[PDB]
Write a protein that binds this ligand. Structure first.
Ligand code: GTP
Ligand code: GDP
Ligand code: GDP
Ligand code: MG
Lengths: 430, 48, 49, 31, 357, 442, 49, 430
């Protein structure tokens, strides 16, 4: 049961570099690729993310794509950069310019065949292939355009597998790019047709996590990308270690998505402890559950108090009783019953895995499907309508060749997604 | 019956030994190829 | 009973999802080397004979 | 001024929430 | 052209190459270290060699496949005196050490013993005459060392004191309890004796004592301190001032051949169904052979079940958790091998003792 | 004499580990399969035979299959302590799970695997000379247990015919729950269990958690405790085949005495001296006390109260040092009680069995050592309350088609939901009708 | 027992045009054709008399 | 079973010198001709390419022909030049001038009798003669004209043997000679009637092999001719070493050619991989098959994705299992079924030989018969038609004496070859 990773654009390549550092650390792989680990439990599932090269070595099943190699030169120069296969780096000769149409239509069609050749070579090497995993930002240029292009091609070629994306979405307070509403709207239109499950992260939520919870004096993008790599490596943990109640990506999808358009989820990771307070709170399943539901620990700007939970999932790592997990999930559902959709009798799935991450006694990752996500799309649609009515920057996209009708389709589809969420929020038994 | 059982034990031991020898040969060839690659790289650097 | 020629190997501390400091900011020169467009071999390390 | 997460904490739990450690109990019926 | 040629056989290749394959085992008192297996190869062209570790794990189709990872990568290693490793150093029964651990599976320097050697593809046989085989400076130090006679007399009287007082005239149980305070195994793979441990050891012989008056107690303390000082200074010490347990039992128990050690380890391997270093007391109860013993079958002087209970008694941790480590088993069989002289008597009683499959 | 065990999915394999641990330790087979030749009383002494067969070299191997779609649990069995006990062919594992979808197990994936399982079972059934039933362990809450368990029971029922099939089944508990789609899988499972099982025993984890908290003194129980209790129950029921006793009970006698009508085959199970070693020195444990214990609802392994219904038949198994006169006095004391009621068409409500072998003690176990125990299986109308709550939860979700597109995509008609829900409604009405006192002339 | 295959890779240069943009409801759906199955109602209905 | 080699023109003599270096290395023959090998397996088939000279020496059964001795003087001065028999070098006194008519009609007919006399002496010296093997370029002058003349004479004198050619053909992007279309068209017209099997190589494709796959910084014609000599020596390896499933040139022809005009093949060699990359990918039979079908590893500019495979052949060298070879060829045929002609149930033949080339664990050479070769002939016919309408440079050929009807027939024959390939590509069962 093998996962294939794709890293696209600057954000994607940097997060991927930190992810593969975290994964190589957990399995005890030296940056030369030699296994130096200390338990058989590490070796028996190494195949899930690594392929074996001759006399010891392991290589990571990842494709790196970007339109200008600058980020790739930074990752190759990094401390773990040597592990990556040279043939797996695909690049053009000029940048995306933060423009969706350029990234999708001009350099996209030029590069895409070499990316599909690498992705097929990587997928067909697996003895049994599990879903794909993609990291990119939606506000950028090559991230949005090449991510959605590649996703559409892989969905044509592998329609029976799972398609999973991790995605960075524009903050509500400060933009990093002026033309963000167009790129976001078009990318969400592509995702709602093509994707099976999508996670959304706001950089503002990670900044507030770092400053309030971890009280870091001088955080850097390495810390934010470490938090993301921690949750990403946590969702798959039950795939690759033994446990009392095994779980799988398809089982999460089957339990989380009630209807096929409603596949956008909130993410969190629980055992964040402040730099000077570990003496004040012992580890326990209640403590993890309390942090798990605190909105302070959620990586999106929308708050649960304005919506209702359709479904949620918790994956526990560590040696613990099943009774405490079940009774905690019962107590939280019973005490807060107004925030759970009433025509579903139990919204939370639990799973338990024996092997915690190194240096932590226990950990949990939380995935939540909540209707308050509709507030983000409404805000993006407002900003899109403000820009489009005045043709604010439209000549770039139209000059590349886009039909204006594409923009009205994407707006209508997002507005219908918001309406569908609002209708399911206020549904009743009668 | 005793003779048959001891003969079967000897046969199983031989089978296990062969299965180990295969992997040993694999590893030896891998090391040889690595050293060949090292020598070729050194020659290229000198020429440059 | 004395240690022989080969040396002890040291292993670094685990990577907890929190409790990391800004070690990337301790450098004082950030020149970037072009590898992909120029070097055919790239920076592949091959040991000496 | 530092920005803040716009969500306030509502959900609360406790350790050992069950009554006498039992999920349910049957009533007494006389004879 | 034989019918059993593989991919790398010389009959299937034009090019030729030289090498030397070997298998190794680890010399340690730890139980888990006994199950491990290693293999490697030696290249005389560069005087460099590597060594791997083999493990058995379930495969993709269900049956077991063997997996390996490096234990010592390719390098031109040197001895303690700086000389290189020649071909003669990889003979059967050669003990050598290379250096500190290079992975997380070990915690200290360890010794390795070659158990198999193949030279079907070796064409350069190098060897230095009048030289020691392998890297075994500790064994040379033990061979060249000499101990004092009064130390041997002190250990003789101490052994007598244990055999009578701590046992009940049974020498095996007496010798077994003699190494009770030195059970812990270090990162080196061998057990160490401290001076305080030696003082506690000599005091337990129940021989240096008298009436509970103050002067008599002081005299007994002085006597036991003098004896412990005499024994302690007769053996070589390492850093942190400790001596070796194996070199101690070389003069308590005596020399022991390799065949006896192999047979004892084979019994331990058969009885251990997990791969930890512990035996369960229920397995010992089920696999012991009190029933066919002639003192219970043909003489009717002892009862079978009572003698079984008495045998279960002697283990130090039978009433609390029921786990017997490797060191305790080896101590019991050290006593057993010390008691008997002849090889065939030892092997016959060893085979009759346990009714394993 | 012989019985074959079939273990399906995660719960069934994990319960199998505890069962075979117990049966090994009770008979005396070592983990590598070798009796010391002392644990038996002489030659022509064949008690293991119900569960083990010996090879010509004297190794023992057990009469079981392990079925799973994910490798991990079977690979844990392959790498564990009992590696040498099982024949490698017996441990069957697929590549990927049924992802909590009954439709995926039944139509897509189990359909590929079912003929290998049937061939293995055939290889077992050919090595028998008095096979008298199949024991099946599975959970109906998960995808492969429901779908492949149903498909396999259908195929077994066509191929073997009259041979009995007894199921131990983990049903979805009334308020502890682990997955959202449990009602759909459990409803679809129950149709097959209705048609293709002779007696079905129902279990809920919430009841065994309550029993281990209340009676045992365990603050933080886990599934291994529940599995040890299940293993004890199975050992008690099969002890009647394996050891000497005053009143033996063959597996056909259970069906003859306990089942009044061919649909009325769902039974409650309870076990009396669940007690800790520290508790054991404060109490005597006489026959009448444990007989009084098996009738309290705090003793039950399913979350239902039998005081809300009427008993039709009870089967009481006593093992250990018991004398029949004390069993008769106990049963007469139970009969006097006013809160225990039998339907008026069942005057002779009890079947008894008495076996001399006391229950075995497992080294890591939590039960005390006791000289006697009693185990009860009983048929009661109270079970109708379990179906009403599952059916209500099904109706709540299905009113909005909450998850149906997964099931329809993996190959199932929407009509199958309504059929199954109506079949459970008819089973509910059967339990209403059978429990109605007498009749009327008009 | 399936072992890995070999893929030669397709050509998708000419399939991307700005005039053929994605529309609503055009996502790729994998629907397995339904296969009918028989059922055996061996158990008789309740006959309590 | 003896092969006779013919080397014609500059390209042929240069490739031949490197080929005979490779063969002398594989059999351990010193440049003095003395055997210095290290296994009996080398000696026991030495007769296949060498004749025995007195007291040890071996001489290679090859004829070198050229119209100006410059190349021959360069190869004779080379490090292995001494091995060649002095009487086997035949040369004139003035060049072909890159003109087909000069090479075919004036100096061709002048020299050809001495070449035929040497070839007959060589054929009649064999105890049993296998086919002839000829290396030449089609774009040149003496190579094309005198090579095809000699081919016609040998087919008259030895019609029951095999005729095999390796041929260099003009790149689609840059010409090495201005008058290439005439010489190519006339030579292909001669070959399609006379030849039994013809292999085609683009120098541009070898450049792309070196740059993309091998990443050489400073390749030289010695490297391109080494790749060609490697493949050439690989096709014959099963003729001259033991193996589990022997094969032969006639058996290859019988399995590859469905109809006698369809005898033009694509070539490839698999374990090509850059010195930087080799640490990242181990050699294995799936890996050879993956490289084997990658169009990157094929020595022609036409790509298989525009055509369909009628037939293919793979020759494996080494001690290896038959199960992986047979099942890999089945899996590739089943998964890519649209690229395989459907009215043939199995398109791939396999063969296995025990002895790999020195210093490689395994190797395969691939021969493919694919309809996409029709686009190359169409391009040559287009350029020919462009030149002929304007009578481009025709006076050179007409002044030598050629009738224009040769040009119109050769154009018509190539156009009919393109049409017949196109018809079989789109054929159906009905
Ligand atoms: N008593 C007990 N219950 C268990 C055990 N394991 C899982 N369960 C319960 O059974 C249900 C889950 O069923 P599973 O066995 O995991 O389902 P499955 O057979 O693996 O089906 P798939 O998920 O499709 O592979 C939940 O209600 C769990 O609480 C166990 O070991 N003992
Ligand atoms: N968390 C995180 N966000 C990033 C990183 N790099 C860029 N971003 C964000 O991603 C958006 C910019 O997209 P970008 O990656 O530059 O798009 P591209 O030009 O197509 O590669 C902005 O919101 C950045 O704040 C990173 O390393 N980590
Ligand atoms: N691959 C390869 N091609 C060559 C070599 N020498 C010449 N050629 C090519 O062959 C063509 C020239 O033909 P040439 O041999 O000069 O014809 P000739 O004058 O009749 O001998 C051009 O396309 C050259 O690129 C060589 O050593 N290797
Ligand atoms: Mg499962």
């Amino acid at each position: 049961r093998e996962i294939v990773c794709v890293q696209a654009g600057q954000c994607g390549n940097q997060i991927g570099s930190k992810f593969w550092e975290v994964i190589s650390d957990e399995h005890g792989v030296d940056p030369t690729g030699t296994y130096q680990g200390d338990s058989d439990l590490q070796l028996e599932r190494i195949n899930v993310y690594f392929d074996e090269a001759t006399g010891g070595r392991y290589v990571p099943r990842s494709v790196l794509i970007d339109l200008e190699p600058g980020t790739m030169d930074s990752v190759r120069a990094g401390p773990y950069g040597q592990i990556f296969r040279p043939d797996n780096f695909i690049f053009g000769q000029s940048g995306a310019g933060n423009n969706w149409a350029k990234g999708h239509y001009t350099e996209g069609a030029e590069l895409i065949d070499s990316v599909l050749d690498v992705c097929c070579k990587e997928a067909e090497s697996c003895d049994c292939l599990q879903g794909f995993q993609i990291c990119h930002s939606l506000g950028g240029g090559t991230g949005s355009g090449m991510g959605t292009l590649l996703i559409s091609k892989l969905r044509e070629q592998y329609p029976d597998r799972i398609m999973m994306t991790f995605s960075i979405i524009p903050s509500p307070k400060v933009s990093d790019t002026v033309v963000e509403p167009y790129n976001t709207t078009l990318s969400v239109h592509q995702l709602v047709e093509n994707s099976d499950e999508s996670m959304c992260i706001d950089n503002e939520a990670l900044y507030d996590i770092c400053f309030r919870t971890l009280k870091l004096t001088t955080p850097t993008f390495g810390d934010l990308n470490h938090l993301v790599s921690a949750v990403v490596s946590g969702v798959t943990c039950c795939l690759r270690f033994p446990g009392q109640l095994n779980s799988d990506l398809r089982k999460l999808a089957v339990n989380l998505v009630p209807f096929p358009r409603l596949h956008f989820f909130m993410m969190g990771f629980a055992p964040l402890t402040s730099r000077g307070s570990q003496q004040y709170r012992g580890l326990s399943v209640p403590e993890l559950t309390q942090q798990m539901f605190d909105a302070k620990n959620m990586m999106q700007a929308a708050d649960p108090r304005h919506g209702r939970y359709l479904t949620a999932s918790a994956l526990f790592r560590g040696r613990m009783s099943t009774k405490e997990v079940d009774e905690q999930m019962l107590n939280v559902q019973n005490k807060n019953s107004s925030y759970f959709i009433e025509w579903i009798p139990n919204n939370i799935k639990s799973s338990v895995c024996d092997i915690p991450p190194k240096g932590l006694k226990m950990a949990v990752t939380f995935i939540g499907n909540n209707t308050c996500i509709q507030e983000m799309f409404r805000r993006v649609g407002e900003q899109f309508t403000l820009m489009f009515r005045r043709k604010a920057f439209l000549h770039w996209y139209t000059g590349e060749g886009m039909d204006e009708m594409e923009f009205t389709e994407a707006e209508s589809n997002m507005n219908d997604l918001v309406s569908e969420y609002q209708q399911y929020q206020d549904a009743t038994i009668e | 019956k005793r003779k048959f059982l001891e003969d079967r034990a000897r046969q199983r031991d031989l089978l296990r030994r062969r299965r180990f020898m295969e992997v040993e040969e694999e590893r030896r060839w891998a090391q040889q190829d690595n050293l060949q690659l090292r020598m070729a790289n050194a020659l290229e650097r000198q020429k440059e | 009973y004395q240690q022989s020629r080969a040396l002890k190997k040291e292993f670094s501390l685990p990577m907890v999802p929190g409790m990391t400091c800004g070690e990337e900011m301790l450098r004082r020169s950030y020149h970037r080397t072009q590898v992909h467009g120029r070097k055919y071999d790239t920076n592949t390390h091959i040991d000496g004979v | 001024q530092h920005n803040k997460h716009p969500g306030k904490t509502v959900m609360f739990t406790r350790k050992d929430p069950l009554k006498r450690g039992l999920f349910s109990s049957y009533p007494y019926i006389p004879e | 052209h034989s019918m059993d040629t593989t991919l790398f056989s010389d009959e299937n290749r034009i090019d030729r190459g030289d090498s030397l394959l070997f298998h190794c085992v680890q010399l340690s008192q730890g139980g888990t270290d006994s199950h491990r297996y290693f293999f490697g190869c030696y290249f005389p062209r560069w005087r460099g060699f590597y060594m791997d570790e083999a493990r058995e794990l379930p495969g993709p189709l269900g049956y077991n496949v063997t997996r390996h990872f490096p234990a010592f990568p390719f390098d031109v290693y040197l001895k303690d005196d700086g000389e290189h490793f020649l071909t003669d150093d990889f003979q059967i029964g050669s003990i050598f050490t290379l250096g500190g651990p290079l992975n997380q599976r070990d915690d200290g320097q360890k010794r390795y013993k070659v158990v198999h050697c193949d030279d079907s593809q070796l064409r350069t046989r190098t060897g230095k005459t009048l030289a020691f085989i392998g890297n075994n400076v500790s064994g040379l130090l033990q061979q060249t060392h000499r101990v004092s006679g009064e130390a041997i007399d002190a250990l003789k009287r101490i052994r007598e004191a244990y055999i009578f007082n701590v046992g009940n005239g049974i020498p095996e149980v007496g010798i077994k309890a003699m190494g009770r305070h030195f059970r812990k195994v270090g990162s080196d793979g061998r057990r160490w004796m401290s001076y305080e441990g030696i003082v506690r050891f000599v005091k337990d012989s129940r021989n240096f004592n008298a009436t509970l008056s103050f002067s008599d107690t002081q005299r007994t303390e002085e006597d036991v301190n003098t004896v412990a000082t005499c024994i302690y200074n007769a053996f070589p010490k390492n850093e942190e001032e400790c001596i070796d347990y194996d070199f101690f039992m070389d003069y308590v128990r005596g020399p022991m051949s390799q065949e006896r050690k192999d047979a004892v380890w084979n019994i331990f391997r058969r009885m251990d169904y997990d791969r930890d270093g512990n035996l369960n007391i229920i397995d010992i109860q089920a696999c012991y052979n009190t029933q066919d013993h002639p003192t219970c079958s043909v003489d009717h002087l002892f009862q079978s079940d009572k003698m079984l209970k008495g045998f279960l008694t002697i283990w130090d941790e039978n009433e609390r958790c029921g786990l017997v480590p490797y060191a305790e088993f080896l101590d019991y069989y050290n006593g057993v091998s010390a008691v008997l002289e002849d090889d065939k008597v030892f092997f016959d009683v060893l085979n009759n003792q346990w009714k394993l499959l | 004499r012989e019985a074959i065990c079939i273990h399906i999915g995660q719960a069934g394999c994990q319960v199998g580990n505890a069962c075979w641990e117990l049966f090994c330790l009770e008979h005396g087979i070592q983990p590598d399969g070798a009796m010391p030749s002392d644990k038996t009383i002489g030659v022509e002494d064949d008690a293991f035979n119900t569960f083990f067969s010996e090879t010509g070299a004297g190794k023992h191997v057990p009469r079981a299959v392990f079925l799973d779609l994910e490798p991990t649990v079977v690979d844990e069995v392959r790498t564990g302590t009992y590696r040498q006990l099982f024949h490698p062919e017996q441990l069957i594992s697929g590549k990927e799970d049924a992802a909590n979808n009954y439709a995926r197990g039944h139509y897509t994936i189990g359909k590929e695997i079912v003929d290998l399982c049937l061939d293995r079972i055939r290889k077992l059934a050919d090595n028998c000379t008095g096979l008298q039933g199949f024991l099946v362990y599975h959970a109906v809450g998960g995808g492969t247990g429901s779908g492949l368990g149903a498909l396999l029971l259908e195929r077994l029922s066509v191929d073997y015919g009259k041979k009995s099939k007894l199921g131990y089944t983990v049903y979805p508990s009334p308020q502890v729950s682990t997955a959202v789609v449990e009602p759909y899988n459990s409803v679809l499972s129950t149709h097959s269990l209705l048609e293709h099982t002779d007696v079905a025993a129902m279990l809920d984890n919430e009841a065994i958690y309550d029993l281990t908290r209340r009676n045992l003194d365990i603050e933080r129980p886990t599934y291994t405790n529940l599995n040890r209790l299940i293993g004890q129950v199975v050992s008690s029921l099969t002890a009647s085949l394996r050891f000497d006793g005053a009143l033996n009970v063959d597996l056909t006698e259970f069906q003859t005495n306990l089942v009044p009508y061919p649909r009325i085959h769902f039974v409650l199970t309870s076990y009396a001296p669940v007690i800790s070693a520290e508790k054991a020195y404060h109490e005597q444990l006489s026959v009448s006390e444990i007989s009084n214990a098996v009738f309290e609802p705090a003793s039950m392994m399913t979350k239902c109260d039998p005081r809300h219904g009427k008993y039709m038949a009870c089967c009481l198994m006593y093992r250990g040092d018991v004398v029949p006169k004390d069993v008769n006095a106990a049963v007469a004391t139970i009969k006097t009680k006013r809160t225990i009621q039998f339907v008026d068409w069942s005057p002779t409500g009890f079947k008894c069995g008495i076996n001399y072998q006391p229950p075995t003690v497992v080294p890591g176990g939590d039960l005390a050592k006791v000289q006697r125990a009693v185990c009860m299986i009983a048929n009661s109308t109270a079970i109708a309350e379990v179906f009403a709550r599952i059916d209500h939860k099904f109706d709540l979700m299905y009113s909005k088609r909450a998850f149906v597109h997964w099931y329809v995509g993996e190959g199932m008609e929407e009509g199958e939901f309504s059929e199954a829900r109506e079949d459970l409604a008819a089973l509910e009405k059967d339990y209403e009708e059978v429990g109605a006192e007498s009749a009327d002339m008009d | 027992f399936k072992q890995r295959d070999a893929v030669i890779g397709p050509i998708v240069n000419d399939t991307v045009d700005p005039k053929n943009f994605l529309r609503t409801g055009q996502g790729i759906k994998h629907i397995v054709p339904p296969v009918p199955h028989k059922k055996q109602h061996r158990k008789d209905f309740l006959d309590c008399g």
